[PDB]
Amino acid sequence: SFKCVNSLKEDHNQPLFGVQFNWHSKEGDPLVFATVGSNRVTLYECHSQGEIRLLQSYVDADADENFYTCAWTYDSNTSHPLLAVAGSRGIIRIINPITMQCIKHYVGHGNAINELKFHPRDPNLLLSVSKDHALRLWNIQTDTLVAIFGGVEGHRDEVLSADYDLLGEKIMSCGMDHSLKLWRINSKRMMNAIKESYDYNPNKTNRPFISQKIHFPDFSTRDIHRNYVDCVRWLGDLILSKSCENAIVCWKPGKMEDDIDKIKPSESNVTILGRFDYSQCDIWYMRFSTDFWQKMLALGNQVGKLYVWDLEVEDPHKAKCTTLTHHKCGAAIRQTSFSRDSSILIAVCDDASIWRWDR
Numbered sequence: 001s002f003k004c005v006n007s008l009k010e011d012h013n014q015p016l017f018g019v020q021f022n023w024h025s026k027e028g029d030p031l032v033f034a035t036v037g038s039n040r041v042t043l044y045e046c047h048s049q050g051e052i053r054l055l056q057s058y059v060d061a062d063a064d065e066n067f068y069t070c071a072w073t074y075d076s077n078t079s080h081p082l083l084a085v086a087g088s089r090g091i092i093r094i095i096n097p098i099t100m101q102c103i104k105h106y107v108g109h110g111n112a113i114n115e116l117k118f119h120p121r122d123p124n125l126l127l128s129v130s131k132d133h134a135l136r137l138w139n140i141q142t143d144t145l146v147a148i149f150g151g152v153e154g155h156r157d158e159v160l161s162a163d164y165d166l167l168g169e170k171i172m173s174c175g176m177d178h179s180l181k182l183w184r185i186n187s188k189r190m191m192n193a194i195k196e197s198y199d200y201n202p203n204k205t206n207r208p209f210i211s212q213k214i215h216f217p218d219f220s221t222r223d224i225h226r227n228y229v230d231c232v233r234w235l236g237d238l239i240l241s242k243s244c245e246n247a248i249v250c251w252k253p254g255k256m257e258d259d260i261d262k263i264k265p266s267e268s269n270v271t272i273l274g275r276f277d278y279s280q281c282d283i284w285y286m287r288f289s290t291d292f293w294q295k296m297l298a299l300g301n302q303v304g305k306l307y308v309w310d311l312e313v314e315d316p317h318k319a320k321c322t323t324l325t326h327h328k329c330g331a332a333i334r335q336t337s338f339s340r341d342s343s344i345l346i347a348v349c350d351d352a353s354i355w356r357w358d359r
């Protein structure tokens with residue numbers, strides 16, 4: 001069971017909107033996590049007796065930048081960890097976490113970036129979701145924009161979240177238009193676009209790299225939630241998603257026995273497999289997280305309470321809930337992060353505080 005072993009507060013006193021453990025940290029090295037809030041990203045190291053050691057920050061040159069998301073990857077040639085951050089300026093920054101130098105940046109989105117995700121099998125493929133209603137897929141090895149997921153049949157309002165499935169064959173995205181949309185990236189067109197992005201070297205050719213314009217999702221529903229959908233994650237072939245209605249819904253496209261890879265774009269049905277209710281989390285912009293193995297699910301609420309669900313059960317509706325409270329933790333928990341082994345759970349808050357829970 002989890003016990004709160006420590007807490008701290010960042011000096012900017014602004015909300016912390018993101019937190020991620022580095023699940024690519026090397027064997028024998030202490031566990032490391034990043035936080036994003038105000039116009040900065042900060043790294044910490046977890047030590048014994050609940051110690052959280054402060055390392056170093058990246059502070060944006062723009063005092064008006066607001067980072068909203070961060071994601072870890074590694075350099076595909078050296079294995080060294082890399083950290084990607086983005087927010088209100090709509091600029092993706094690739095940071096060397098050792099020195100906190102910005103090694104490169106990507107511009108493209110017409111507005112703020114709400115979430116970054118790396119492909120589960122390819123460390124170079126980065127997905128960004130934006131307030132400009134689109135998703136973008138980048139190849140950070142050749143610095144190319146592989147594809148833009150948008151158009152009339154794409155999202156009709158700001159995109160808040162997206163997630164890759166287990167093999168990175170498809171993406172589920174969600175946002176302010178109340179919809180959840182599926183985008184297959186294992187199509188002949190998308191597998192070819194990814195192969196071409198790797199073959200692109202602007203020093204060895206005259207052509208610009210041509211980005212795919214994907215204007216039609218492979219599935220779409222507005223039947224799960226009745227407000228902004230601000231967080232989505234795959235749970236095998238099933239989906240976990242939430243709005244600001246005090247619930248995480250577990251669902252799938254089509255009928256109960258329909259295989260996800262047989263689903264057609266015209267599919268009009270969904271199946272609800274369960275719903276995890278909770279309290280006082282009815283404000284926009286609150287994220288839930290799962291651990292590496294997807295044995296657990298965590299979400300914080302707007303008054304500092306943590307909910308943890310044990311997903312190691314036969315069916316999703318049988319998940320077992322644990323609640324974690326501390327008399328000094330009373331600010332909204334925007335995001336949580338589990339260490340790769342789930343031995344540590346970190347919660348980050350609206351008052352710039354960080355809470356460490358050890359198993």
Ligand SMILES: O=C1NCc2cc(C(F)(F)F)ccc2-c2cnc(NCc3c(F)ccc4occc34)n3cnc1c23
Pocket residue numbers: 015017018066068069112113114115159160161230231284285286287334335
């Ligand atoms: O218009 C905004 N303004 C900054 C802001 C301000 C507050 C306030 F309460 F502090 F005022 C709360 C949330 C946000 C915020 C927080 N987070 C995002 N995007 C990232 C995000 C999502 F896109 C979806 C769920 C999330 O859970 C926590 C962060 C998060 N925002 C995008 N635009 C805004 C946000």
